[PDB]
Amino acid sequence: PLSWEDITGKGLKQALDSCQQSFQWQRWNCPSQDFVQKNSKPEENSPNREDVYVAAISMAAIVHTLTKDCANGVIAGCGCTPCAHEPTKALEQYEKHFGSGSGAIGHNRRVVGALLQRSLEQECRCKQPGAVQGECQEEECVAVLKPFEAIAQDLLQMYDDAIQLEGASSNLKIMWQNIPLDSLVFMQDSPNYC
Template identity: 25%
Template sequence: MNLLPSGICFYLSVAICWLTSRVDGSWWYMGTLGSQVMCDNIPGLINKQRQLCRQHPKVMQAIGAGIKDWIGECQHQFQNHRWNCNTMARDHNLFGRLLLRSSREAAFVYAISSAGVVHTLTRACSQGELQSCSCDPTKKGSSRDAKGTFDWGGCSDHVEHAMRFSQSFIDAKERKERDARALMNLHNNRAGRKAVKRFMSLECKCHGVSGSCSVRTCWLALADFRRTGDHLRRRYNGAVQVAMNQYGTGFTTAQRHFKRPSKNDLVYFEDSPDYCIRDQESGSVGTGGRVCNRTSRAVDSCEVMCCGRGYDTTRVSRTTKCECKFHWCCAVHCRDCNQEMDVHTCKAQT
C-alpha cells in the first residue's frame, strides 16, 4: 500500500508560501482577469480549486492572511517538544518532508490547518471583510436554552458557511486521489473543522429594568483559537493508529486492542521518528541547539530534549523590569535590572 500522497494538498504546499507572500492584497485589485491569471499560476491547485480561487479572490486573501495564526498555534502547542512544528523557509512545502510520512505529526498539521482556515473565514465573514458572507442569517427570531427563552440578535458567527467552503476547497484534491493517504487527510481535515464548531458559545446581553434580564438577546460566537489548539493537541496525544480495511474504503485499527477512531479523533498510519537527529528523509531537523530545562523532568528536560547527547551551558545577561512602583494616579515606574542566568542548549549530533 502506498501511503505517500501523490501531491501535498494546496494549503500545505508551496502555494501557501505563495499566498503568504502576497497577503498585502495588491494583486487582488487587478480585476477579474488579474485574479484569473494569478489563480492559474498558484502551484499545487487542481481545477476545482483554481475555479474557486477565481470566483473568490478575497477569500483566498483571507486564508493567506490567517496562515500565521494556525502555524503560531501549532508552534505554541509543541514549543517544548522535540518536534516543535518548525517550518522550512526554502523547502517545497512549509514542513519539509515531514508531511510525506503518515505520522501523527502530519495528522495534527492537517487538522490544525483545516481548523485555522475555518476560524479565519468565519471571523472574516462576521467582520464584513467578504462580500460572499456575513453574519449567520439563520439566527433569527426566538429560541430557548437552559436559562429560558431568548431573542437572536447581534452578529452570530457563520461557521457553517466557513466549514462548507473549507471542505469544498481544501478537500478537493484529496477527494480526487482517494488513496489511503488521501482518506487519512480527509479524516483529519474534518476533525479540525469540527473542533472549531465544537467551541462555538452562546453569548447574551440582558435587557430589563435594573438589569433584571427579563429579555435576553443572544448570538453564537467563535471561541479563541487557543481552545481549538488545546483540543486538537489532546486529540494528537490520543491519536489512533489505523490501517485500510480490506475494501480500501475506510479504516480499521492497526491493533486489535486499539479503540475504533471516532470522527473527532486524529488518525495516522506510520510511527513517528524520534526527531532527535537531523534526517532529511523523515523531515526531522533534530534537536541540536534547542534550549532545554536542566531541572525539569518533563519533555522539555535536557535529558529528553537532547536525546542523551548532553548540553552546553552559556551564561547570558538579560534586562528585566524590577522594583516597579505605582504612582498616583496612572503611572508605574520601574528600574531596568540586569540578571545573569544560565541557558542550556542541546549538543549537536556528532
C-alpha cells in the same frame, strides 16, 4: 469579496503561532521551516502524527478565520446584514476550495470539522450604542467560535490521543461510523527528531 490568498495567509500565521506555542517544549518544536513545508507539500499517502496535527491546526485556523471574517461582514457572499458565527457554512466553502480528501486525510478533515461545530460559545454586547460592559442592563447575544487558543488545545489533545492505522489505504474512504469522529488518525511512525 472572498480572497483565498488572504484567508489562508492569516490562517496559517495563526496556525503557526499556536503550533509553536503548543510544541515549544517538545522535541519537534514546530520549527517554522518544517511547518510551512508541511503545508506547501503535505504528506497525504502515509502521514505521521505530526503531519496530522499540522494539517488539522492549519485547516482549523483557516476555517476559524473564514467563519469570523464572514460574521464581521468583511467578506462578500457570507455573513449578515450582531452576527452569529456560521462554522458549518465556512466548512462547506473549505471543502469546495480544498478537496474533500480520502484515507486518513479525509477522516481527519471530518474530525476537525466536527470539532469546530462543537466549538461554539456566545458573546454578549450592550443594547445601547455606546455603552461598556459595566454600564448596560440589557445585552444582545450571538453565537461565536471560541478563541483559537482553546480550539488549538483541543487539537493538541486529539493529537495526543490519535489512533495509528495499519494496512490503511490513502485512496479508500474509511467507513462512516467506524472510527469515532473525535479521533484523529495517522499511519506512519515519526522519525527521531533529535
